Amino acid sequence: MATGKIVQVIGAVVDVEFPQDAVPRVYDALEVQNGNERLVLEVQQQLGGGIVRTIAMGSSDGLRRGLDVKDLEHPIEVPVGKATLGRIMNVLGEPVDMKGEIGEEERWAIHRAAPSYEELSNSQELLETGIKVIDLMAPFAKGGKVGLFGGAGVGKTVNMMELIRNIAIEHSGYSVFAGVGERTREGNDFYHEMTDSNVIDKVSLVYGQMNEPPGNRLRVALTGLTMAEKFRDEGRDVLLFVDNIYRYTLAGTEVSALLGRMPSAVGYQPTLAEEMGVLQERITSTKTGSITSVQAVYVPADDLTDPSPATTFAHLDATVVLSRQIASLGIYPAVDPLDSTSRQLDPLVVGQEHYDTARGVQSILQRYQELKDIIAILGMDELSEEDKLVVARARKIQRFLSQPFFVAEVFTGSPGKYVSLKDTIRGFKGIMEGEYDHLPEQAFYMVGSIEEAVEKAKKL
Amino acid sequence: TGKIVQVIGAVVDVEFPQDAVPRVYDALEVQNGNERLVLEVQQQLGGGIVRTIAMGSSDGLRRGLDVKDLEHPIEVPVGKATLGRIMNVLGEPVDMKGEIGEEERWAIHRAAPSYEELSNSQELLETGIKVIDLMAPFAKGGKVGLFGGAGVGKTVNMMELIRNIAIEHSGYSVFAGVGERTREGNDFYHEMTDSNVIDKVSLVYGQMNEPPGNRLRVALTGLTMAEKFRDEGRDVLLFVDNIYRYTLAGTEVSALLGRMPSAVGYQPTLAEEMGVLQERITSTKTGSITSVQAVYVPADDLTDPSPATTFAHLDATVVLSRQIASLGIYPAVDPLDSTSRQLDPLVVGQEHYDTARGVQSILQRYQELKDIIAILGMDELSEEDKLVVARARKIQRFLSQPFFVAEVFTGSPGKYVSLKDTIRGFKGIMEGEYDHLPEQAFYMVGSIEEAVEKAKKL
Amino acid sequence: QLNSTEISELIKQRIAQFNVVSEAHNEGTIVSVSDGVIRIHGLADCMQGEMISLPGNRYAIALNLERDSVGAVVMGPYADLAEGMKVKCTGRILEVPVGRGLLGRVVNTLGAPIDGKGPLDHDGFSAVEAIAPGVIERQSVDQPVQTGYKAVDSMIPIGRGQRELIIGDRQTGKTALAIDAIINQRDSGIKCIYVAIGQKASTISNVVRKLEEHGALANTIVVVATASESAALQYLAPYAGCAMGEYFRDRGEDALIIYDDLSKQAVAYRQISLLLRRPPGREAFPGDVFYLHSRLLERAARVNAEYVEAFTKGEVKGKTGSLTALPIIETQAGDVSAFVPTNVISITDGQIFLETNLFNAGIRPAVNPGISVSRVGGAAQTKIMKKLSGGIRTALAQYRELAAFSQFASDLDDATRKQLDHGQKVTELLKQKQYAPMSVAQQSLVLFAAERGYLADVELSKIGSFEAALLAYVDRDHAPLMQEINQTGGYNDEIEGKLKGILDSFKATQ
Amino acid sequence: KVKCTGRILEVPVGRGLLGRVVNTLGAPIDGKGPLDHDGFSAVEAIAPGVIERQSVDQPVQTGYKAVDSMIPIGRGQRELIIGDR
Amino acid sequence: EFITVARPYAKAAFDFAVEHQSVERWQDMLAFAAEVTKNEQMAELLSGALAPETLAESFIAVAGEQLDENGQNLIRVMAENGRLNALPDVLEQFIHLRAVSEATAEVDVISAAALSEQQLAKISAAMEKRLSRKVKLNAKIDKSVMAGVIIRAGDMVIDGSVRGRLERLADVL
Ligand SMILES: Nc1ncnc2c1ncn2[C@@H]1O[C@H](COP(=O)(O)OP(=O)(O)OP(=O)(O)O)[C@@H](O)[C@H]1O
Ligand SMILES: Nc1ncnc2c1ncn2[C@@H]1O[C@H](COP(=O)(O)OP(=O)(O)O)[C@@H](O)[C@H]1O
Ligand SMILES: Nc1ncnc2c1ncn2[C@@H]1O[C@H](COP(=O)(O)OP(=O)(O)O)[C@@H](O)[C@H]1O
Ligand SMILES: [Mg+2]
Ligand SMILES: [Mg+2]
């Protein structure tokens, strides 16, 4: 039985009037017959006299005043669980994929409180991703946040696919990919590249792209997160990918402007630092499971002080920078090891040996960065006999960082490798302290453990 | 007689019969719980409604309370009776001593003296500070203002001026602490009481814990005591520890009074609210007020509307800067921005004027060279430009001075420098007779004869 | 022409009988709900600042008593509320539970426990909003508050009753220095309080279990308002922490309170102020943002014994209480010429500025001299520390600027080869490891054998092992005065002689 | 109660104003007694039209080498003096 | 114009009048108040800055033919809000609300000359089938129509006038 009446329509904002006692609550979902298609409205404010101001999860065109509105007694609810693996859905949990229907057993509301204080895991742990550069220079905390800062062409998608693969095969978790406010072309070719790599069976996709009304681009991230939470409750370790969190911030700004709230520090909404925390606070390790998150980040005008980057960096635990220079060198993954950062490189968190190994590698590479500039203007033979050795070890460290991925075989043919942390610690200790000096630099390129480097040097 | 009908933070709306509505600065009284709260009416709306600012904490006020119409403005004790004592914004005693023995009480809202009643004086006043009375000398009965951001030295300087003039001075003195730390008010009070000079200094405090109304009206209630001492024919010293907090306390209240905001948030009436106060603190033909005002500048922005509109009301403006303070060069005065009405050859003599202008000229020339030194290094400079650079750095060091009040931040003894010695030293540096000493010989010394000694010990 | 929250059925109730005040003044009804702000109709008895009780177990704070309705903010999840809910006014101004039974608990901003250990053993309730002691009730701060850090106890001394800003960029050791200053009070009679505003819950749980490991948790109260929680809780949390510390202050005891981020209390208050449609000022902050922090930090004070007598009705005769505050501020890109950082620099006494460049270069804690100051100064220090460390911060203020200007070469080598090796080794020996607090004796001997030579020629750059051997030699054999120079703080020639003797006695064996 | 005069702000004017200090309403404030004005003039008025003007071809001398040589001012000219404090 | 401010007051007055079975009396009470609102002297008083309470009493006095429930409460509530000038609209909304619950429509007809009362009764019975209400026709004699009739039923209109067809033809060309 419908009970409300549409009273206003201004852009994507719809006001509906209910009996004085039946007023919906704040985040409840209403629905309307916009012609033949049904339309879902998410309430945003309760005004006086039974009026309720909501935002349309769809196209607002065609709505009359006085249309009948039906009050669903619950927030937006989406399917969760195994049934959603390999599918594609929109904010409302509807298959935009055309493989039919989702046979979910259960549905969850996208809005809920973060884990309680006594519910968090009283421990701190690393996530072995299996990638040498990330595991060494920027380890992942199980339940932390990670930023991806590279541009395009640098292979970001292959990095995400390798993570999706390794978290499923080597660990025993699943993954959710929430694409908020990004090109539809990239989501289509990402789905196709994932089905051409047999990882689609292990990831659940949710999309709100640039062509979507503001509310979809706002709530898609909460849909992805609430699926990741159902995977967490089952006792698993989950990976959640957010394809651009800056667009989540920007869609919150658009919705705030539509509701008519005063502009904050740089025009952003006044609720910026709370809208961000309400998302990022649900991504935590718990004593039943954990959700780790990888978030592609975009910095407006290359300004690390702008309120959006400034608010995002408060939550990230690690930061991986992708550089085109490293890719032009033919090194993949193209992770820049000097700027890549993690706050788990704390000798009491990860240990003294790992910490000092990473610091040594970094010092060697940032010395090579200047010896390269000296060479570029004075020639090789100006360097002293000591610098000529640090260059020789730098050019080998710089190549032992490359790796073959199980998903990159279509490019390099190599079977792809998963490298344990202690083994890469061993390998870089070796290369760094002069051991393995007696083999050429090409013996380290695109190889797994250092024993495979010595055996390749044998074959070479 | 009337009843509260609204409470928005610091502002309160009161309804009266239309035949009894109060006037536009009268005081009103409310029984807030068990305490007694005073409201000052700011506006007469229609219908008999009146908008007021609470001279106290606003919490606990119900709407519908009865309020009592005092038919006179806020009035404070004044005169001899108020000398060795601390007072509230309402003129109530705030030290634990008994009541004040005043015979007369004055309303804190008063008109400025007439134009034919003013007086102007060239009589230079000496301070033991090199930079201040070289670059920005000020005269008996004039206005001085210390501009700076946060942490740059405004209070350590005002206290040095107090020590160097206010003790070896005959007449009375008044200190108004408008929205500053209570710790510093207690320290000042105990310093005065332990120097047996408290019998000449009258204190008022509206420190930064107080609600907006106290910080708003405390400066006026202090100016009223200064004015009473002036009208008795005396000559008075008036120290205002932060006048910016007088305008700020207005801004906080401005929006609640229903006034559309102006340029950077300030109230529309910023320049009138400031001029109505600054213009009654002046010397007259019956008496003179020599005043020192600290003037906080927010975010170090000297172009913010409040400093910009305050610059016009002062005779001597001493501008402190954070860049100089970060070099350890206290007092951190910027000599390329401090100025004075009295820095004219017909007032200070030709030698002083020429010395000050030469100092300015070569510090400005060094400013013009800094940007090329940053890029190319100091080796590209002409042979005579290296000399102006070195002499400019030596002047910048010699402008520093140790203070008797800073004797607890560093250990150095305080130094008092006479005007003759400072011009004798700067004229010596400028013409190169001290070119052979290192820069460190000039850091934190008194006269130049102490720099020549410090050079021997490196 | 706009409506003013007068609606059909409320007008109908007034139609039934105009004087509805014949009904209870004790209660009203919610009329609208938006982003945590609530409008209530009725509540003729409400007073500003009052706690209004909502269905469930929740409270709102009455901010506005307008002509016909009360504007309030909800202290908790607000989405559960709806129009027409009956609401009752408790006749209490906002008050938090307080007492010494809170020590070792983790509590919500409303004093509701958040650990699993059950209810509170609080003494009573005290108002969250108060006016600090007057100017005549204060007393001069002249007692030392000891942090474990050789750098700050020397350059930036702190004193019971003082207020030290800890300001710096993100990830520069602010919380490290704060919780280490808390840990160092484990056995010095001075209570601790840590209030975390806007911090993500993993961090707070980690620091709580870290405090528990080192045995400090039994001595501290933890107040938490995490990043997920309503803006009203984040904005009112530090006032609850201050109200909890002010109890010990007013009983003539000592407390040290740490506000983990005032730069996020400011943001929560800006959110609340902009949702209430107030005109913003510089950087979009409200006009009264200064008055937000001042009336808070002005409550950290040291009070004379007459005030403690007048407060406790005579019961604690002749002891002086104090509350020491250390607020933390985060500044973007290292600039301090910003609105809120400069607002707080204009309120606290001292200023410990932690620099990102030093922090990356390995100099930790990255206490930047020349910018950092202590406005209380040597009055806070034990006279030994005061005399040994006379003017070195201003020495480094110029050492830094000169090493920055004279980049091409060490020219004019009069003594710069000694000056800029002394000033290098001093920096190198101020370096320290966290969770390793050095008592005043260990700091004092180390400072004496750096500050008047004895190590300006020997640039050995093996300083960590040298000092770890020195402090071990003096503990095992060479000194029982390590429990005398740390009991008094005295600076005699008779003890200077013993210090020189032990100095050379150790020296002759390295 | 308020009564509306049909008048518009007028101010004293004349040669007797010459050498006096006067407030914006024409009242003396120097204390040297009343004004020897020559009637009153309207504060708000209309400037002379296009055809009533004449070309500026007469100098008004500042006595400053920097201005009179390179930024001349003529009788009837409007010259802004603009700068910082 | 204050339709939007009058909606709540009209809805409250009507929703109260049906709890007390006196819609018909309330309508004329509001009509009296709507007329007093128009006087040239009363319109001068309503503009002045009197206190809402005494301004409400200065309005009760000129209308004693009012219930305790109706005048002495509604006028006071509207005075507290300063809404009294809205009374002429609070009336119309009230009428409209009534016509909704009573399932009635005030269809208007326009013609060049009187209709035969067979035409008009057919119009009534036909509109009552087009709509789902008891219609209440009122005619207007407008000469510019010349022939035929305009039937206006709120925002719906059916135009059969020869002028409308003529100027439609003029735009077919
Ligand atoms: N003296 C020190 N020596 C070595 N490492 C240190 C020292 N102090 C702090 N650290 C390390 O620096 C890291 C960051 O410090 P911390 O988290 O306290 O900074 P913060 O001010 O809390 O930053 P934010 O609160 O913005 O995250 C910590 O992991 C800690 O291990
Ligand atoms: N691990 C890898 N091994 C080999 N080649 C790689 C690897 N990662 C990336 N590449 C190369 O880099 C290219 C980057 O293209 P693409 O992944 O589409 O960039 P982006 O995904 O950022 O748009 C890949 O098509 C592939 O040729
Ligand atoms: N001559 C000086 N010697 C040493 N420190 C000084 C001197 N002048 C100012 N300062 C410094 O100024 C700091 C800030 O205090 P103050 O000058 O009162 O600040 P504000 O200008 O904000 O009132 C003091 O802690 C002190 O170190
Ligand atoms: Mg000060
Ligand atoms: Mg921290």
Site of tokens 């019969």: B17
Determine the residue type at C165. Answer: L
Whether the CB of C432 sits within 6 Å of ligand 1: yes
Our answer on whether the CB atom of C175 is closer than 6 Å to any ligand 1 atom is yes
CB contact B3 to E (< 8 Å): no
Separation of CA C184 and ligand 5 centre (Å): 18
Residues of B in contact with D21 (CB under 8 A): 115
Superfamily classification of domain C382-510: ATP synthase alpha/beta chain, C-terminal domain (1.20.150.20)
Residue closest to C185 by CA, chosen among C258, C98, C260, C109: C258
Length of chain B: 458
**C-alpha torsion sign, points C171, C175, C180, C183:** negative
Cross-chain Cβ contact A114/C198 below 8 Å? no
Within 10 Å of residue B447's Cβ, how many Cβ atoms? 18
Structure obtained using: cryo-EM
Please enumerate in sequence order all residues whose Cβ is within 8 A of that of B337, keeping only pairs 6 or more positions apart, or say none: B302, B317, B319, B321
What is the 8-class DSSP label of residue C302?
Answer: B
Q: Could you tell me the end-to-end alpha-carbon distance of chain D, in angstroms, rounded to an integer?
A: 45
Residue C13's nearest CA partner among A117, A45, E15 is E15
The owner of tokens 């009153």 is: D40
Cis (ω within 30 of 0) for the bond into A333? yes
Task: Among C46, C282, C298, select the one facing B182 at the smallest CB separation.
Answer: C298
Q: How far apart are CA A335 and CA A402, in angstroms?
A: 9
CB A332 near ligand 2, within 6 Å: yes
> Could you tell me the two tokens for A13?
């904002």
- Which DSSP string do the residues of C154-214 spell out, in sequence order? HHS-EETT-BEEEEE-SSSSHHHHHHHHHHHGGGSS-EEEEEEES--HHHHHHHHHHHHHT
SS3 A173: coil
Residues of B in contact with D83 (CB under 8 A): none
Q: Which residues of B are catalytic?
A: 154, 180-181
C170 lines ligand 1 (CB under 6 A): yes
Give the residue from C277, C378, C292 showing the smallest Cα distance to C34. Answer: C277
Any idea what the Cα angle at residue B187 is, between residues B185 and B193, rounded to 5°? 100
Residue B151 Cα to ligand 3 middle (Å): 6
CA of B191 to the centre of ligand 2 (A): 74
Active site residues of C: 375
Structure letter (DSSP) for residue C453: B
**How many DSSP H helices and E strands does chain A contain?**
14, 19
Query: Looking at chain D from residue 21 to 80, which residues have their Cβ under 8 Å from any Cβ of chain B?
Result: 21, 29-31
Nearest CA in chain D to B338: D85
| Fold of domain E3-101 | Peroxidase; domain 1 (1.10.520)
Cβ–Cβ gap B410/C390 under 8 Å: yes
The CA distance from B145 to B291, in Å, is 8
Q: Are B239 and B158 in contact (CB under 8 A)?
A: yes
Annotate chain B with three-state secondary structure.
Answer: CEEEEEEECCEEEEECCCCCCCCCCEEEEEEECCEEEEEEEEEECHHHEEEEEECCCCCCCECCCEEEEEEEECEEEECHHHCCCEECCCCCECCCCCCCCCCEEEECCCCCCCHHHECCCCCEECCCCHHHHHHCCEECCCEEEEEECCCCCHHHHHHHHHHHHHCCCCCCEEEEECCCCHHHHHHHHHHHHHCCCHHHEEEEECCCCCCHHHHHHHHHHHHHHHHHHHHCCCEEEEEECCCHHHHHHHHHHHCCCCCCCCCCCCCCCHHHHHHHHHCCCCCECCCEEEEEEEEECHHHCCCCHHHHHHHHHCCEEEEECHHHHCCCCCCCECCCCCEECCCCHHHHCHHHHHHHHHHHHHHHHHHHHHHHHHHHCHHHCCHHHHHHHHHHHHHHHHCCCCCCCCCCCCCCCCCCCCHHHHHHHHHHHHCCCCCCCCHHHHCCCCCHHHHHHHHHCC
Phi/psi class of residue C282: alpha, beta or left (left: φ > 0; alpha: ψ in -120 to 50)? beta
Domain boundaries, given as residue ranges, for chain C: 1-92, 93-381, 382-510
Residue D82 amino acid letter = I
CATH number of this structure's domain C1-92, picked from the four choices 2.40.30.20, 3.30.70.20, 1.10.1240.10, 1.20.120.450: 2.40.30.20
- B115–D21: do the CB atoms touch at under 8 Å? yes
- Scanning B131-170 for CB atoms below 8 A from E yields none
Chain B residues close to E52, C-beta within 8 Å: 47
- The span from the CA of B370 to the CA of B372, in Å, is 6
Q: C and A: touch, per 3+ CB pairs < 8 A?
A: yes
A414 touches ligand 2 (CB under 6 Å): no
Distances A330 to A155, B312, D41 between C-alpha atoms, Å: 11, 66, 87
State in Å: Cα B387 to ligand 4 middle: 38
Cross-chain CB nearest to D30 (options B116, B308, B312)? B116
Q: Which C-chain residues 140-199 have CB contacts (< 8 A) with chain B?
A: 140-141, 161
Angle at which helices C174-184 and C201-213 pack, to 10 degrees?
30
Encoded tokens for A290? 């954990």
- Cα E115–Cα E118–Cα E121 angle in degrees, nearest 5: 95
User: Which domains occur in chain B, in start order?
Assistant: 1-73 (2.40.10.170), 74-342 (3.40.50.300), 343-458 (1.10.1140.10)
3-state DSSP call for residue A14?
Answer: strand
Task: Classify strands C106-107 and C124-127 as parallel, antiparallel or unpaired.
Answer: unpaired
Domain range C93-381, CATH class: alpha beta
Residue E149: which of E109, E106, E114, E107 has the closest Cα?
E109
CB pairs under 8 A between B and E: 10
* Beta pairing, strands A13-17 & A4-10: antiparallel
C70: Cβ–Cβ under 8 A, 6 or more apart, which residues?
A: C28, C39, C40, C41, C43, C46, C52, C62, C64
How far is CA B392 from each of CA B129, B389, B430, C370, rounded to the nearest angstrom?
Answer: 19, 5, 9, 21
Question: Which C positions 294-353 lie with beta carbon below 8 A of chain A?
Answer: 332-333
Q: Which chain D residues are Cβ-neighbours of B311 within 8 angstroms?
A: 85
Element (H, E) at E47: helix E42-47
Report the separation in Å between the CA atom of A410 and the middle of ligand 2, taken as the mean of its atom positions. 11
| Residue A262 to residue C35, Cβ atoms within 8 A | no
Q: Which of C4, C7, C8 to substitute to test the interface with E, most E CBs within 10 Å?
A: C8
CB contact under 8 A, C18 and E81: no
- What are the backbone dihedrals phi and psi of residue B296, each rounded to the nearest 5 degrees, phi first? -70, 140
